[PDB]
């Protein structure tokens, strides 16, 4: 039986410059869903994967951005992206969650992923307090990011967050090796892909790096899933073609 819980992170820069790249995807592999950090739909997907709209920040709560969220036929919707690094307090996000985001479950019967905070103390403390404030109306999924070089350390973090918040499944909305050594990137990617596949309470995980330009200095050139011409790397090929993954 083919395990399929691998999210295709499709950065909006792909939609802008290299639409045609989406047709070079392998859809007969472990690829399961798609997301693009936005409310709007990447048309080049042509509904070949379930799409998860995201309410990225306070700028996607009004106008056309909110209409995109209200009118979607897609089943699962993400809340804020790393709100702790954008001046959104747990008090704030909780009061938005109750007043407008809740309606998407109670009325439109959508499943809601929590805000995906970073795996640093500030992020862990932010989700801890938010989940507590909205405990009477909890999210359907716990959203996590993880970045580092030690695969054994990502596992303990997921095991640690599953222990702290045991009442729903986990989605890893972003993750990658930050290692500048490719064998250590390939090594980590392959380890956790195979590990998360056979962990029942991990619903889906989303490998970062599918975009032409480097997102920032923090992430690794060796962990890129798309070359500068829009073609796919070997890491991307294996990510979307191989289950189990292999080095």
Ligand X SMILES: OC[C@H]1O[C@@H](O[C@@H]2[C@@H](O)[C@H](O)O[C@H](CO)[C@H]2O)[C@H](O)[C@@H](O)[C@@H]1O
Angle between helices 182-197 and 151-164 (to 10 degrees): 30
Residues 187-206 that bind ligand X (CB under 6 A): 187-188, 191
Please give the backbone phi and psi of residue 243, each rounded to the nearest 5 degrees, phi first: -145, 105
1, 63, 200, 247: which one binds ligand X (CB under 6 A): 247
Q: Which is nearer to ligand X, 146 or 232 (CB)?
A: 146
Q: Least CB distance from residue 186 to ligand X, whole Å? A: 6
SS3 146: strand
Spatial distance between the Cα atoms of 62 and 105, rounded to a whole number of angstroms: 18
Q: How many residues bind ligand X (CB under 6 A)?
A: 10
Residues 68-107 that bind ligand X (CB under 6 A): none
In angstroms, the Cα distances linking 151 to 74, 178, 207 are 32, 11, 13
Q: Which is nearer to ligand X, 152 or 164 (CB)?
A: 152
Contact flag: residue 244 with ligand X (CB under 6 A): no
Give the nearest residue (CB) to ligand X. Answer: 187
Contact flag: residue 184 with ligand X (CB under 6 A): yes
Q: Which is nearer to ligand X, 168 or 191 (CB)?
A: 191
Spatial distance between the Cα atoms of 84 and 199, rounded to a whole number of angstroms: 28
- Near ligand X by CB under 6 A, which window of 12-20, 57-65, 110-118, 180-188? 180-188
Q: Report whether 182 contacts 149 (CB < 8 A).
A: no
Q: Which two tokens stand for residue 228?
A: 């500068």
Q: Which is nearer to ligand X, 54 or 193 (CB)?
A: 193
Q: Which is nearer to ligand X, 84 or 184 (CB)?
A: 184
What is the secondary structure of 160-179 as a DSSP string?
A: HHHHHSTTS-EEEEEEEE--
Site string for ligand X, 120-159 (x = CB under 6 A): -----------------------------xxxx-------
Contacting residues for 145 by C-beta, under 8 A, at least 6 apart: 82, 116, 117, 118, 119, 123, 172, 173, 174, 175
Contact flag: residue 15 with ligand X (CB under 6 A): no
Spatial distance between the Cα atoms of 202 and 199, rounded to a whole number of angstroms: 6
183, 201, 213, 215: which one binds ligand X (CB under 6 A): 183
Binding site for ligand X (CB under 6 A): 149-152, 183-184, 187-188, 191, 247
């Amino acid at each position: 039986h083919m395990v399929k819980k691998r999210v295709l992170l499709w950065d909006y820069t792909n939609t802008r410059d290299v639409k045609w790249a989406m047709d070079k995807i392998n859809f007969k592999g472990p690829l399961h869903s798609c997301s693009n950090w936005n409310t709007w739909y990447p048309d080049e997907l042509k509904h070949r994967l379930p799409f998860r709209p995201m309410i990225h920040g306070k700028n996607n709560l009004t106008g056309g951005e909110w209409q995109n969220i209200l009118k979607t036929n897609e089943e699962v919707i993400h809340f804020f992206n790393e709100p702790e690094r954008a001046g959104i307090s747990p008090e704030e996000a909780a009061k938005i969650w109750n007043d407008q985001v809740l309606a998407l479950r109670t009325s439109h019967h959508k499943r809601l992923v929590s805000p995906s905070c970073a795996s640093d103390p500030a992020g862990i403390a932010w989700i801890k307090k938010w989940m507590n404030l909205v405990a009477k109306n909890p999210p359907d999924y716990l959203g996590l990011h993880w970045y580092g070089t030690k695969g054994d350390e990502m596992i303990r973090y997921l095991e640690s967050m599953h222990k702290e918040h045991p009442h729903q499944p986990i989605i890893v909305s972003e993750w990658a090796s930050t290692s500048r050594s490719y064998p250590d990137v390939l090594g980590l990617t392959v380890q956790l892909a195979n590990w998360m596949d056979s962990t029942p309470w991990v619903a889906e995980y989303a490998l970062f790096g599918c975009m032409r330009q480097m997102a920032d200095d923090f992430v690794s050139p060796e962990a890129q899933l798309m070359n500068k011409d829009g073609s796919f790397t070997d890491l991307m090929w294996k990510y979307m073609s191989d289950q189990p993954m292999h080095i």
